[PDB]
Amino acid sequence: HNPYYFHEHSFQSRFRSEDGHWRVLERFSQRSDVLRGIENNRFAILEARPQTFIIPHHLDAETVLLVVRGRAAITTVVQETKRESYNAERGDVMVIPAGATIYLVNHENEDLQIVKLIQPINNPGEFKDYLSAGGEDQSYYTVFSNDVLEAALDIPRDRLERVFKQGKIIKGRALIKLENQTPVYSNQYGQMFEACPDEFPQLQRTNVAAAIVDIKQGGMMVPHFNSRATWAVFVAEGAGSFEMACPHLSSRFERVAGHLSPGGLLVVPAGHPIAVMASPKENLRLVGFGINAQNNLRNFLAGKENIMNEVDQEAKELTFNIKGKEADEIFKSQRESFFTKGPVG
Amino acid sequence: HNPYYFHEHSFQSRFRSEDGHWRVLERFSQRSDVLRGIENNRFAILEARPQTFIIPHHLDAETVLLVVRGRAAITTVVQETKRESYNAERGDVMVIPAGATIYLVNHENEDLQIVKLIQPINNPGEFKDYLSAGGEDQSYYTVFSNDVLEAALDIPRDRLERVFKQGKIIKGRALIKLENQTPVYSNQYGQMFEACPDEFPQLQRTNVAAAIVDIKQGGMMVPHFNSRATWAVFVAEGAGSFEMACPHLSSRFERVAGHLSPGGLLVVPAGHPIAVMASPKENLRLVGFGINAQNNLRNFLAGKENIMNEVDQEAKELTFNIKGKEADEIFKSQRESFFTKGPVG
Amino acid sequence: HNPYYFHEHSFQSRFRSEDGHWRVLERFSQRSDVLRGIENNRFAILEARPQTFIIPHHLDAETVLLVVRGRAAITTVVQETKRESYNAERGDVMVIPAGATIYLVNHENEDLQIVKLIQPINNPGEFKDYLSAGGEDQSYYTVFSNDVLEAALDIPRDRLERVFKQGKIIKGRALIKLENQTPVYSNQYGQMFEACPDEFPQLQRTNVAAAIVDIKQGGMMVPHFNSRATWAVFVAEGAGSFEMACPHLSSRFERVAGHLSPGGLLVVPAGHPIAVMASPKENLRLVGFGINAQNNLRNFLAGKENIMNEVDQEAKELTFNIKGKEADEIFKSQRESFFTKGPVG
Ligand SMILES: [Cu+2]
Ligand SMILES: [Cu+2]
Ligand SMILES: [Cu+2]
């Protein structure tokens, strides 16, 4: 009865090794139908234990990187050929071209969490991992004929047999630091940082936008919706809950309700009205990428600055049960904007 | 034997209330196959009796508005938040973003017809209607928990129970006035007004172009076709008929023939040669939107200015049965261009 | 066991007449699945014997023309109406809009080969041919009512019965000359000419890029891959062979191997590592169009200038079995770049 929320476990696992876990959430078209326009997107995550390394690789796919926890040092290379390497702490955003080869090192004493947004460039809603070391079958040097390897590298074939044979995580104007930006919505009850294509050319490729939201203890992000963007948001830390009105689940809306437990992913389509509560005990951080966000507007149904306030009184009078001015009693009554103090029970 | 034409009745109805009728034509992939590249488009219409109001709402979808009959006053709002309201008479074009909330009033003593072109932003070829009042299930305030409503609006929950509870049509650089523009084709036998993306940034989003065609009594729009654009055209007023050559219905063309009765919709794919007759009795107005029109050329097979005239004689000589000059006897013989006097019988 | 390669015969034939052969390769979704993101593309070819003519026509589809063998004179017209005609020798590239009408003449004493890349504008991965002469069913004048023809052209209907009745190949800032451009990769062992969207606005439409590759006798194009572009490449002249590592054929790579015999087509998806050998006896020319190439990078796994060289030593040390410097022994050892001397046996 609730399609839009995926659990920790619903992640299709990729690796599961001591040094790290790299796993991708299944596409949006197994399970549901109502998610289609985002199907060429895949949400994935990465974990790498302290003192870890990740092999040089690439994807036939576009990646949007957002680091959740810890720290790592990133490197991207392409081809005349150029090198770019960066410092990644919590709340960093990177836009990694398809075919662009990248490695990384987690040199740090606690874990490293990284959330990727991957758009397959080849087969729609299907991507993969092109890798330098592993398997009898797993290297893009290792698998090739020794005659063509030996020819190509200009070195003796038995000597090749000792280097490129002898998975990905082992022991050890591109980036923009997201959390180091200016919150579009802050107040007291929570803060939201956002990087969008309209301000950031590097995003215009991947089509998407990147964000990080915090809602304080017992806070709330008021009912509202996204113009165009379809957001996929992951639960970084904490717990909470949400209500979203769904027409598909015949324009009658049924309420979609649920709790956000750590390591979950919620999908919030364009124009979907949503309100979010950050729970009695702890705070809640959501971290995640919107699909299709360009000139995407967020419109609020409550709070001081919202859409109602900007409508003529007559509209309000005919629409609801309220008067020419007495409308303002109702919609200016939330003294805060965006986030405010939420429900109980 | 004729896919491209839909009747009045083939419209999937939405409302059917005294004050108004809002209905959407089914997509193009029930029935046929040959219409695919336009499937993410949906043609819809709106009728609102005199002294009528339409609720604030939005769609997860892009809308291209063209008013057919009568008059109405339009309003759009989004979110810092801004208001835009406009005057709409016959032949007005508006481009309404997804998620952008809009209301309208028909204050006028005759009916109001409005034709919408809707592109689903969420689920391809599937859109919907996000609404403020109706149902036990039908409001995006009404359905939400009173605890989150009460929290969010900062007002007592029983007091909420008397306002947001107590369908859409009830009793009561965005727009450009299309009919007030300059006809690309006029002569005597008919006049055609067109607004295209290449001249109009607001269209570049929605990808489409907007047009209104009049063909006089017994007039004709000569055989021709659209470069790229796939046109969906509705029959505003009058009656008439058409011939269009279809290869799908194996490059052998079969003739597609039919009559345009009021309230119909014809689809004319890119490169589809078409000729149109405005009938013995009355005139014919077509009103409608082209899909995929950018730098879209219209090429004419007859009439003074047309494509043949600009080809070398040798081509014409080898191609048809005609001579080096005697080709010009054949293709300059229509003394008019575009529209001319049509057939009989 | 090898999807990516199509034979001469796998071409869906269109015409087969003495004066010419026009045939289109079937789409990429009969046979395989792994080719999807290119399905709206169709590769086609054209052959026209000496002293031949091709009718004025158009497609509901975008064409990218590359001439292989011989010579022909090209003409394009659209609509106010304009004419453009050009000289085409071996290695010429043209970008032909949908709906744009075109004819051609092979006036020359040997054959004429032309490779087209066609993107359906109407029905995805489905295009067609709009033609002036043939059939009882085959003309877009011939099929139309005489009443509407006679009306439209302003000439007597029996007189129409003697001109437009009395297939396509019969007896007889748009173009850029590709082979007359500057090779991006040359050395001795082979030369590669390329025209891309990023340098050529006319390509930005069709989305694609155009190329011609020569690999000398016993030459090789070293293992490498394309960032974004999915290349479809045809075998102009000669023979040869290739190895490409495929993950789909579960990130374990299996080697895809084969021989390129004349008149074949190979598909090389984005990020697919490939090495190519030009065979013991003759040389090898590949001719063809990349899909989705914008800012598409080609990255090399061997050869003096390649991606490894630009990575830090520590990466190389952890990755492979090699030392801080002794890495450079391995990857700078190919004294050439791009093409070099290949295997034997
Ligand atoms: Cu929904
Ligand atoms: Cu057709
Ligand atoms: Cu593959």
Side-chain angles (χ1 to χ4, degrees), chain A residues 34 227-228 243 253 271-272 299-301 305 312 333-334, chain B residues 58 79 83 98 103 122-123 130 137 141 145 152 154 205:
Chain A
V34 24
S227 148
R228 262 172 303 282
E243 288 187 20
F253 290 18
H272 265 59
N299 295 315
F300 296 105
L301 299 181
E305 284 261 38
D312 54 64
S333 174
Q334 174 64 247
Chain B
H58 66 265
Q79 192 191 356
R83 189 179 132 105
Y103 56 80
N122 257 358
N123 218 272
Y130 297 79
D137 347 286
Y141 288 93
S145 49
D154 210 334
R205 343 170 60 256

PDB file of all heavy atoms in Angstrom, chain A residues 34 227-228 243 253 271-272 299-301 305 312 333-334, chain B residues 58 79 83 98 103 122-123 130 137 141 145 152 154 205:
ATOM      1  N   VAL A  34       3.787   3.292 -11.433  1.00  0.00           N
ATOM      2  CA  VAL A  34       3.681   4.726 -11.168  1.00  0.00           C
ATOM      3  C   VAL A  34       5.037   5.469 -11.160  1.00  0.00           C
ATOM      4  O   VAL A  34       5.095   6.689 -11.359  1.00  0.00           O
ATOM      5  CB  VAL A  34       2.900   4.956  -9.839  1.00  0.00           C
ATOM      6  CG1 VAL A  34       2.993   3.732  -8.942  1.00  0.00           C
ATOM      7  CG2 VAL A  34       3.373   6.181  -9.104  1.00  0.00           C
ATOM      8  N   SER A 227       7.524  21.569  -8.385  1.00  0.00           N
ATOM      9  CA  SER A 227       6.967  21.917  -9.681  1.00  0.00           C
ATOM     10  C   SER A 227       7.126  20.804 -10.695  1.00  0.00           C
ATOM     11  O   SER A 227       6.143  20.216 -11.154  1.00  0.00           O
ATOM     12  CB  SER A 227       7.668  23.164 -10.195  1.00  0.00           C
ATOM     13  OG  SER A 227       7.759  23.156 -11.598  1.00  0.00           O
ATOM     14  N   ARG A 228       8.394  20.521 -10.994  1.00  0.00           N
ATOM     15  CA  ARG A 228       8.860  19.573 -12.019  1.00  0.00           C
ATOM     16  C   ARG A 228       9.631  18.389 -11.435  1.00  0.00           C
ATOM     17  O   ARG A 228       9.406  17.237 -11.813  1.00  0.00           O
ATOM     18  CB  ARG A 228       9.696  20.266 -13.098  1.00  0.00           C
ATOM     19  CG  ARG A 228       8.889  20.607 -14.352  1.00  0.00           C
ATOM     20  CD  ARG A 228       9.692  21.461 -15.317  1.00  0.00           C
ATOM     21  NE  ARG A 228      10.140  22.687 -14.660  1.00  0.00           N
ATOM     22  CZ  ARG A 228       9.356  23.741 -14.445  1.00  0.00           C
ATOM     23  NH1 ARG A 228       8.090  23.710 -14.840  1.00  0.00           N
ATOM     24  NH2 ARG A 228       9.832  24.822 -13.837  1.00  0.00           N
ATOM     25  N   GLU A 243       3.848  12.339   5.403  1.00  0.00           N
ATOM     26  CA  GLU A 243       2.566  12.193   4.713  1.00  0.00           C
ATOM     27  C   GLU A 243       2.640  12.831   3.344  1.00  0.00           C
ATOM     28  O   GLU A 243       3.121  13.956   3.202  1.00  0.00           O
ATOM     29  CB  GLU A 243       1.433  12.870   5.479  1.00  0.00           C
ATOM     30  CG  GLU A 243       1.004  12.169   6.755  1.00  0.00           C
ATOM     31  CD  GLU A 243      -0.227  12.803   7.365  1.00  0.00           C
ATOM     32  OE1 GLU A 243      -0.948  13.507   6.628  1.00  0.00           O
ATOM     33  OE2 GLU A 243      -0.472  12.604   8.574  1.00  0.00           O
ATOM     34  N   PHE A 253      -7.753  11.603  -4.039  1.00  0.00           N
ATOM     35  CA  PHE A 253      -6.476  11.445  -3.364  1.00  0.00           C
ATOM     36  C   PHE A 253      -6.639  10.452  -2.222  1.00  0.00           C
ATOM     37  O   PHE A 253      -7.616  10.538  -1.463  1.00  0.00           O
ATOM     38  CB  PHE A 253      -5.999  12.774  -2.776  1.00  0.00           C
ATOM     39  CG  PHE A 253      -5.579  13.788  -3.794  1.00  0.00           C
ATOM     40  CD1 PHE A 253      -5.954  13.674  -5.120  1.00  0.00           C
ATOM     41  CD2 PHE A 253      -4.821  14.870  -3.413  1.00  0.00           C
ATOM     42  CE1 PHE A 253      -5.566  14.626  -6.053  1.00  0.00           C
ATOM     43  CE2 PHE A 253      -4.419  15.816  -4.328  1.00  0.00           C
ATOM     44  CZ  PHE A 253      -4.790  15.697  -5.656  1.00  0.00           C
ATOM     45  N   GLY A 271       5.027  17.811  -8.297  1.00  0.00           N
ATOM     46  CA  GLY A 271       3.692  18.211  -7.909  1.00  0.00           C
ATOM     47  C   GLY A 271       3.074  17.411  -6.769  1.00  0.00           C
ATOM     48  O   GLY A 271       1.907  17.614  -6.435  1.00  0.00           O
ATOM     49  N   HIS A 272       3.837  16.502  -6.166  1.00  0.00           N
ATOM     50  CA  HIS A 272       3.305  15.720  -5.058  1.00  0.00           C
ATOM     51  C   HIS A 272       3.395  16.471  -3.741  1.00  0.00           C
ATOM     52  O   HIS A 272       4.479  16.838  -3.311  1.00  0.00           O
ATOM     53  CB  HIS A 272       3.992  14.368  -4.971  1.00  0.00           C
ATOM     54  CG  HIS A 272       3.243  13.283  -5.671  1.00  0.00           C
ATOM     55  ND1 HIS A 272       2.936  13.337  -7.015  1.00  0.00           N
ATOM     56  CD2 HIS A 272       2.708  12.130  -5.206  1.00  0.00           C
ATOM     57  CE1 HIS A 272       2.266  12.251  -7.352  1.00  0.00           C
ATOM     58  NE2 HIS A 272       2.108  11.506  -6.273  1.00  0.00           N
ATOM     59  N   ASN A 299       6.567  24.805  -4.120  1.00  0.00           N
ATOM     60  CA  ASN A 299       5.450  25.640  -3.667  1.00  0.00           C
ATOM     61  C   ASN A 299       4.849  25.179  -2.352  1.00  0.00           C
ATOM     62  O   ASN A 299       4.498  24.000  -2.195  1.00  0.00           O
ATOM     63  CB  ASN A 299       4.373  25.708  -4.739  1.00  0.00           C
ATOM     64  CG  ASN A 299       4.852  26.409  -5.983  1.00  0.00           C
ATOM     65  OD1 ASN A 299       5.487  27.462  -5.908  1.00  0.00           O
ATOM     66  ND2 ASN A 299       4.567  25.822  -7.137  1.00  0.00           N
ATOM     67  N   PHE A 300       4.728  26.113  -1.415  1.00  0.00           N
ATOM     68  CA  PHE A 300       4.267  25.792  -0.067  1.00  0.00           C
ATOM     69  C   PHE A 300       2.783  26.071   0.218  1.00  0.00           C
ATOM     70  O   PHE A 300       2.237  27.107  -0.147  1.00  0.00           O
ATOM     71  CB  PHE A 300       5.135  26.503   0.968  1.00  0.00           C
ATOM     72  CG  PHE A 300       6.556  26.049   0.967  1.00  0.00           C
ATOM     73  CD1 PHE A 300       7.544  26.837   0.425  1.00  0.00           C
ATOM     74  CD2 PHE A 300       6.902  24.841   1.522  1.00  0.00           C
ATOM     75  CE1 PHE A 300       8.839  26.412   0.424  1.00  0.00           C
ATOM     76  CE2 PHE A 300       8.195  24.411   1.518  1.00  0.00           C
ATOM     77  CZ  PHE A 300       9.166  25.198   0.975  1.00  0.00           C
ATOM     78  N   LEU A 301       2.156  25.125   0.900  1.00  0.00           N
ATOM     79  CA  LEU A 301       0.744  25.203   1.222  1.00  0.00           C
ATOM     80  C   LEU A 301       0.431  25.870   2.561  1.00  0.00           C
ATOM     81  O   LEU A 301      -0.731  26.165   2.850  1.00  0.00           O
ATOM     82  CB  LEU A 301       0.162  23.799   1.235  1.00  0.00           C
ATOM     83  CG  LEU A 301       0.252  23.052  -0.086  1.00  0.00           C
ATOM     84  CD1 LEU A 301      -0.397  21.688   0.067  1.00  0.00           C
ATOM     85  CD2 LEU A 301      -0.406  23.864  -1.198  1.00  0.00           C
ATOM     86  N   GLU A 305       5.299  32.619   4.139  1.00  0.00           N
ATOM     87  CA  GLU A 305       5.420  32.786   2.708  1.00  0.00           C
ATOM     88  C   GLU A 305       5.044  31.458   2.032  1.00  0.00           C
ATOM     89  O   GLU A 305       5.676  30.428   2.245  1.00  0.00           O
ATOM     90  CB  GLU A 305       6.806  33.328   2.316  1.00  0.00           C
ATOM     91  CG  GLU A 305       7.020  34.849   2.577  1.00  0.00           C
ATOM     92  CD  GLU A 305       6.830  35.735   1.323  1.00  0.00           C
ATOM     93  OE1 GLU A 305       5.924  35.443   0.509  1.00  0.00           O
ATOM     94  OE2 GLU A 305       7.571  36.735   1.146  1.00  0.00           O
ATOM     95  N   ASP A 312      -5.798  36.445  -4.845  1.00  0.00           N
ATOM     96  CA  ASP A 312      -6.842  37.402  -4.502  1.00  0.00           C
ATOM     97  C   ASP A 312      -7.879  36.793  -3.555  1.00  0.00           C
ATOM     98  O   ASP A 312      -8.088  35.574  -3.521  1.00  0.00           O
ATOM     99  CB  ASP A 312      -7.505  37.971  -5.760  1.00  0.00           C
ATOM    100  CG  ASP A 312      -8.018  36.890  -6.693  1.00  0.00           C
ATOM    101  OD1 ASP A 312      -8.929  36.136  -6.291  1.00  0.00           O
ATOM    102  OD2 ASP A 312      -7.517  36.802  -7.837  1.00  0.00           O
ATOM    103  N   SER A 333      -1.101  32.690   9.734  1.00  0.00           N
ATOM    104  CA  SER A 333      -1.065  32.285  11.137  1.00  0.00           C
ATOM    105  C   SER A 333       0.135  31.411  11.507  1.00  0.00           C
ATOM    106  O   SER A 333       0.494  31.326  12.687  1.00  0.00           O
ATOM    107  CB  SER A 333      -2.375  31.593  11.531  1.00  0.00           C
ATOM    108  OG  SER A 333      -2.292  31.073  12.848  1.00  0.00           O
ATOM    109  N   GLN A 334       0.757  30.759  10.525  1.00  0.00           N
ATOM    110  CA  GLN A 334       2.015  30.091  10.822  1.00  0.00           C
ATOM    111  C   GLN A 334       3.099  31.162  10.827  1.00  0.00           C
ATOM    112  O   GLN A 334       3.409  31.734   9.784  1.00  0.00           O
ATOM    113  CB  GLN A 334       2.326  29.015   9.783  1.00  0.00           C
ATOM    114  CG  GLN A 334       3.685  28.378   9.959  1.00  0.00           C
ATOM    115  CD  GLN A 334       3.813  27.625  11.265  1.00  0.00           C
ATOM    116  OE1 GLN A 334       4.573  28.020  12.150  1.00  0.00           O
ATOM    117  NE2 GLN A 334       3.095  26.513  11.381  1.00  0.00           N
TER     118      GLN A 334
ATOM    119  N   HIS B  58      -3.022  22.363  -9.873  1.00  0.00           N
ATOM    120  CA  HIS B  58      -1.904  22.203 -10.795  1.00  0.00           C
ATOM    121  C   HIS B  58      -1.889  20.797 -11.362  1.00  0.00           C
ATOM    122  O   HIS B  58      -2.687  19.952 -10.964  1.00  0.00           O
ATOM    123  CB  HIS B  58      -0.586  22.472 -10.095  1.00  0.00           C
ATOM    124  CG  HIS B  58      -0.263  21.460  -9.044  1.00  0.00           C
ATOM    125  ND1 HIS B  58      -0.558  21.654  -7.713  1.00  0.00           N
ATOM    126  CD2 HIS B  58       0.300  20.234  -9.132  1.00  0.00           C
ATOM    127  CE1 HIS B  58      -0.165  20.600  -7.020  1.00  0.00           C
ATOM    128  NE2 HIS B  58       0.349  19.721  -7.858  1.00  0.00           N
ATOM    129  N   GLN B  79       5.907  29.814  -6.403  1.00  0.00           N
ATOM    130  CA  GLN B  79       6.764  30.306  -5.337  1.00  0.00           C
ATOM    131  C   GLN B  79       8.193  29.820  -5.566  1.00  0.00           C
ATOM    132  O   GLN B  79       9.066  30.581  -5.991  1.00  0.00           O
ATOM    133  CB  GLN B  79       6.248  29.852  -3.962  1.00  0.00           C
ATOM    134  CG  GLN B  79       6.917  30.553  -2.790  1.00  0.00           C
ATOM    135  CD  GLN B  79       6.596  29.932  -1.441  1.00  0.00           C
ATOM    136  OE1 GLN B  79       5.796  28.998  -1.346  1.00  0.00           O
ATOM    137  NE2 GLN B  79       7.233  30.445  -0.383  1.00  0.00           N
ATOM    138  N   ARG B  83       2.430  36.564  -8.558  1.00  0.00           N
ATOM    139  CA  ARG B  83       1.091  36.447  -9.123  1.00  0.00           C
ATOM    140  C   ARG B  83       1.125  36.988 -10.550  1.00  0.00           C
ATOM    141  O   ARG B  83       1.740  38.029 -10.805  1.00  0.00           O
ATOM    142  CB  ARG B  83       0.085  37.241  -8.252  1.00  0.00           C
ATOM    143  CG  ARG B  83      -1.412  37.043  -8.578  1.00  0.00           C
ATOM    144  CD  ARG B  83      -2.355  37.865  -7.651  1.00  0.00           C
ATOM    145  NE  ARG B  83      -3.388  38.604  -8.397  1.00  0.00           N
ATOM    146  CZ  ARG B  83      -4.679  38.274  -8.475  1.00  0.00           C
ATOM    147  NH1 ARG B  83      -5.150  37.209  -7.839  1.00  0.00           N
ATOM    148  NH2 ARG B  83      -5.506  39.019  -9.192  1.00  0.00           N
ATOM    149  N   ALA B  98       4.350  23.048 -15.206  1.00  0.00           N
ATOM    150  CA  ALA B  98       3.867  22.003 -14.324  1.00  0.00           C
ATOM    151  C   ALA B  98       4.052  22.533 -12.939  1.00  0.00           C
ATOM    152  O   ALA B  98       4.903  23.388 -12.714  1.00  0.00           O
ATOM    153  CB  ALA B  98       4.675  20.735 -14.509  1.00  0.00           C
ATOM    154  N   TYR B 103      -5.867  29.314 -11.300  1.00  0.00           N
ATOM    155  CA  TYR B 103      -7.327  29.347 -11.348  1.00  0.00           C
ATOM    156  C   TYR B 103      -7.800  30.225 -12.509  1.00  0.00           C
ATOM    157  O   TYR B 103      -6.974  30.812 -13.227  1.00  0.00           O
ATOM    158  CB  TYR B 103      -7.970  29.753 -10.004  1.00  0.00           C
ATOM    159  CG  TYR B 103      -7.519  31.080  -9.452  1.00  0.00           C
ATOM    160  CD1 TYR B 103      -8.049  32.267  -9.929  1.00  0.00           C
ATOM    161  CD2 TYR B 103      -6.573  31.147  -8.439  1.00  0.00           C
ATOM    162  CE1 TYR B 103      -7.644  33.489  -9.419  1.00  0.00           C
ATOM    163  CE2 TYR B 103      -6.156  32.360  -7.930  1.00  0.00           C
ATOM    164  CZ  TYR B 103      -6.694  33.530  -8.421  1.00  0.00           C
ATOM    165  OH  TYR B 103      -6.289  34.745  -7.916  1.00  0.00           O
ATOM    166  N   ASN B 122       5.679  13.447 -15.198  1.00  0.00           N
ATOM    167  CA  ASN B 122       5.977  12.434 -14.196  1.00  0.00           C
ATOM    168  C   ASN B 122       6.011  11.069 -14.807  1.00  0.00           C
ATOM    169  O   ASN B 122       7.076  10.508 -15.043  1.00  0.00           O
ATOM    170  CB  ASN B 122       4.909  12.435 -13.105  1.00  0.00           C
ATOM    171  CG  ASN B 122       5.368  13.120 -11.842  1.00  0.00           C
ATOM    172  OD1 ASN B 122       6.507  13.579 -11.752  1.00  0.00           O
ATOM    173  ND2 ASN B 122       4.472  13.225 -10.868  1.00  0.00           N
ATOM    174  N   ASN B 123       4.825  10.540 -15.062  1.00  0.00           N
ATOM    175  CA  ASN B 123       4.722   9.271 -15.731  1.00  0.00           C
ATOM    176  C   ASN B 123       4.333   9.528 -17.167  1.00  0.00           C
ATOM    177  O   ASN B 123       3.308  10.153 -17.428  1.00  0.00           O
ATOM    178  CB  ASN B 123       3.707   8.379 -15.044  1.00  0.00           C
ATOM    179  CG  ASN B 123       4.148   6.943 -15.017  1.00  0.00           C
ATOM    180  OD1 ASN B 123       3.885   6.183 -15.943  1.00  0.00           O
ATOM    181  ND2 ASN B 123       4.856   6.567 -13.967  1.00  0.00           N
ATOM    182  N   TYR B 130      -4.203  18.104  -9.372  1.00  0.00           N
ATOM    183  CA  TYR B 130      -4.014  18.317  -7.938  1.00  0.00           C
ATOM    184  C   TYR B 130      -4.863  19.488  -7.489  1.00  0.00           C
ATOM    185  O   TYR B 130      -4.639  20.630  -7.926  1.00  0.00           O
ATOM    186  CB  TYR B 130      -2.534  18.527  -7.611  1.00  0.00           C
ATOM    187  CG  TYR B 130      -1.693  17.315  -7.928  1.00  0.00           C
ATOM    188  CD1 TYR B 130      -1.294  17.036  -9.231  1.00  0.00           C
ATOM    189  CD2 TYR B 130      -1.330  16.422  -6.930  1.00  0.00           C
ATOM    190  CE1 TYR B 130      -0.538  15.901  -9.527  1.00  0.00           C
ATOM    191  CE2 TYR B 130      -0.566  15.289  -7.209  1.00  0.00           C
ATOM    192  CZ  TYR B 130      -0.176  15.033  -8.508  1.00  0.00           C
ATOM    193  OH  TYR B 130       0.571  13.912  -8.785  1.00  0.00           O
ATOM    194  N   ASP B 137     -12.398  12.217  -0.185  1.00  0.00           N
ATOM    195  CA  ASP B 137     -11.031  11.978  -0.615  1.00  0.00           C
ATOM    196  C   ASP B 137     -10.391  13.091  -1.452  1.00  0.00           C
ATOM    197  O   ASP B 137      -9.209  13.014  -1.744  1.00  0.00           O
ATOM    198  CB  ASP B 137     -10.977  10.665  -1.401  1.00  0.00           C
ATOM    199  CG  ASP B 137     -12.249   9.841  -1.252  1.00  0.00           C
ATOM    200  OD1 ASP B 137     -12.444   9.254  -0.163  1.00  0.00           O
ATOM    201  OD2 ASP B 137     -13.037   9.769  -2.227  1.00  0.00           O
ATOM    202  N   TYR B 141      -5.726  19.511   1.212  1.00  0.00           N
ATOM    203  CA  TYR B 141      -5.759  19.888   2.612  1.00  0.00           C
ATOM    204  C   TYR B 141      -6.608  18.851   3.341  1.00  0.00           C
ATOM    205  O   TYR B 141      -6.133  18.222   4.280  1.00  0.00           O
ATOM    206  CB  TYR B 141      -6.306  21.283   2.799  1.00  0.00           C
ATOM    207  CG  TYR B 141      -5.389  22.394   2.349  1.00  0.00           C
ATOM    208  CD1 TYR B 141      -5.477  22.915   1.065  1.00  0.00           C
ATOM    209  CD2 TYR B 141      -4.466  22.954   3.216  1.00  0.00           C
ATOM    210  CE1 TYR B 141      -4.654  23.959   0.648  1.00  0.00           C
ATOM    211  CE2 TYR B 141      -3.636  24.002   2.815  1.00  0.00           C
ATOM    212  CZ  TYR B 141      -3.733  24.504   1.525  1.00  0.00           C
ATOM    213  OH  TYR B 141      -2.919  25.550   1.106  1.00  0.00           O
ATOM    214  N   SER B 145      -3.469  14.490   7.958  1.00  0.00           N
ATOM    215  CA  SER B 145      -3.928  14.286   9.312  1.00  0.00           C
ATOM    216  C   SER B 145      -4.215  15.635   9.942  1.00  0.00           C
ATOM    217  O   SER B 145      -3.561  16.634   9.635  1.00  0.00           O
ATOM    218  CB  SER B 145      -2.922  13.476  10.127  1.00  0.00           C
ATOM    219  OG  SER B 145      -1.615  13.995   9.992  1.00  0.00           O
ATOM    220  N   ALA B 152       0.830  22.558  10.953  1.00  0.00           N
ATOM    221  CA  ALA B 152       1.344  23.322   9.810  1.00  0.00           C
ATOM    222  C   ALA B 152       0.743  24.719   9.600  1.00  0.00           C
ATOM    223  O   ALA B 152       1.475  25.673   9.315  1.00  0.00           O
ATOM    224  CB  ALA B 152       1.204  22.514   8.564  1.00  0.00           C
ATOM    225  N   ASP B 154      -0.984  26.389  11.949  1.00  0.00           N
ATOM    226  CA  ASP B 154      -0.994  27.049  13.264  1.00  0.00           C
ATOM    227  C   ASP B 154      -2.389  27.514  13.673  1.00  0.00           C
ATOM    228  O   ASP B 154      -2.574  28.662  14.078  1.00  0.00           O
ATOM    229  CB  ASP B 154      -0.003  28.225  13.323  1.00  0.00           C
ATOM    230  CG  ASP B 154       0.557  28.460  14.725  1.00  0.00           C
ATOM    231  OD1 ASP B 154      -0.122  28.099  15.716  1.00  0.00           O
ATOM    232  OD2 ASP B 154       1.679  29.008  14.832  1.00  0.00           O
ATOM    233  N   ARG B 205      10.323  25.128 -23.837  1.00  0.00           N
ATOM    234  CA  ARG B 205      10.058  24.157 -22.787  1.00  0.00           C
ATOM    235  C   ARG B 205       9.191  23.036 -23.332  1.00  0.00           C
ATOM    236  O   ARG B 205       9.630  21.906 -23.548  1.00  0.00           O
ATOM    237  CB  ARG B 205       9.292  24.824 -21.631  1.00  0.00           C
ATOM    238  CG  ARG B 205       9.324  26.357 -21.604  1.00  0.00           C
ATOM    239  CD  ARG B 205       8.342  26.959 -20.564  1.00  0.00           C
ATOM    240  NE  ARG B 205       8.635  26.530 -19.197  1.00  0.00           N
ATOM    241  CZ  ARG B 205       7.937  25.623 -18.521  1.00  0.00           C
ATOM    242  NH1 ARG B 205       6.871  25.049 -19.069  1.00  0.00           N
ATOM    243  NH2 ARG B 205       8.304  25.291 -17.289  1.00  0.00           N
TER     244      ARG B 205
END
